[PDB]
Amino acid sequence: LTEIEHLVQSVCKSYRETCQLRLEDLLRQRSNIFSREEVTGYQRKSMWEMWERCAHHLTEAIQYVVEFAKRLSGFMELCQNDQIVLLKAGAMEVVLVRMCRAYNADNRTVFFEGKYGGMELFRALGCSELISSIFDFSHSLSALHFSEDEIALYTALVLINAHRPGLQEKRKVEQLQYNLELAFHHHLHKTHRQSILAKLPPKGKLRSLCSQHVERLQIFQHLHPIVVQAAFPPLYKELFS
Ligand SMILES: O=C(O)c1ccc(/N=C/c2c(-c3c(Cl)cccc3C(F)(F)F)noc2-c2cc[nH]c2)cc1
Numbered sequence: 001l002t003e004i005e006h007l008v009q010s011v012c013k014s015y016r017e018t019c020q021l022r023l024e025d026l027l028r029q030r031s032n033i034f035s036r037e038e039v040t041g042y043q044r045k046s047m048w049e050m051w052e053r054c055a056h057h058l059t060e061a062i063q064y065v066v067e068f069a070k071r072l073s074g075f076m077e078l079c080q081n082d083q084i085v086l087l088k089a090g091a092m093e094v095v096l097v098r099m100c101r102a103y104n105a106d107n108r109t110v111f112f113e114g115k116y117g118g119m120e121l122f123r124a125l126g127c128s129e130l131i132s133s134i135f136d137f138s139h140s141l142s143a144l145h146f147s148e149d150e151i152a153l154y155t156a157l158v159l160i161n162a163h164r165p166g167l168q169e170k171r172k173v174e175q176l177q178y179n180l181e182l183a184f185h186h187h188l189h190k191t192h193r194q195s196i197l198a199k200l201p202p203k204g205k206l207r208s209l210c211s212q213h214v215e216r217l218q219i220f221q222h223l224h225p226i227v228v229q230a231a232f233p234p235l236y237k238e239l240f241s
């Protein structure tokens with residue numbers, strides 16, 4: 001079988017082994033919705049407690065994306081500088097895409113600490129506009145009904161982007177990007193799903209939402225810093241130190 005068919009299978013496998021939550025569990029858990037009393041309990045928590053809970057959930061989600069990246073064929077053969085450039089620019093963009101699997105467009109809820117709740121759950125953070133933008137982005141993606149394999153291949157391409165400023169081996173990243181682009185396009189053709197290509201987000205949209213999100217995380221980290229065991233210490237030290 002072709003190099004390309006093996007690449008499709010290796011990306012989909014890496015995604016399945018690092019997807020964090022199973023699509024089947026997320027879909028079954030949709031009727032499990034926070035009560036009005038439970039929502040008020042979250043809204044009454046301090047900004048610093050809600051920050052600690054959200055920062056830790058986001059850090060864990062990032063570490064699943066680092067492991068995904070480390071299993072992509074060719075990623076570990078890039079020099080360490082380029083691994084960090086791609087993960088710094090891309091890992092949180094991948095988390096914001098992965099969110100659509102945990103999002104219910106019928107009631108605008110996300111899976112958070114065991115149940116589905118609306119953006120009002122997060123009232124204590126004082127970030128309603130940013131959180132509203134994140135919910136709207138997931139709402140956009142949800143209308144594609146991405147397959148597990150589509151989201152594996154799309155998120156691989158979010159990370160493997162030869163236009164990220166600061167790459168030292170831009171040609172080696174182009175070669176991996178071209179192969180992943182061919183794998184995605186090959187797979188959409190094979191499954192009669194080329195129709196999603198015209199519906200994917202404007203590329204600057206993900207970058208611009210993500211830059212606002214990370215800027216806000218960096219401000220909270222500065223006021224009330226959390227600490228975690230780095231999966232990728234060189235990357236951690238770039239973001240945290
Ligand atoms: O090695 C590891 O395990 C590891 C774990 C997490 C890392 N960064 C996470 C963050 C955060 C963030 C979060 Cl999630 C919570 C609190 C504070 C921050 C802060 F802003 F301070 F960085 N924000 O953006 C990213 C990011 C990562 C890649 N691109 C953007 C980096 C390495």
Ligand SMILES: CC(C)CCC[C@@H](C)[C@H]1CC[C@H]2[C@@H]3CC=C4C[C@@H](O)CC[C@]4(C)[C@H]3CC[C@]12C
Nearest residue numbers: 020054057058061095098099102110127134216
């Ligand atoms: C701006 C900062 C301070 C607050 C952000 C609040 C909201 C939007 C955050 C807090 C915790 C986050 C979740 C943490 C973990 C996961 C699992 C991952 O597989 C998909 C994304 C998902 C489901 C995140 C979606 C966004 C999320 C719900």
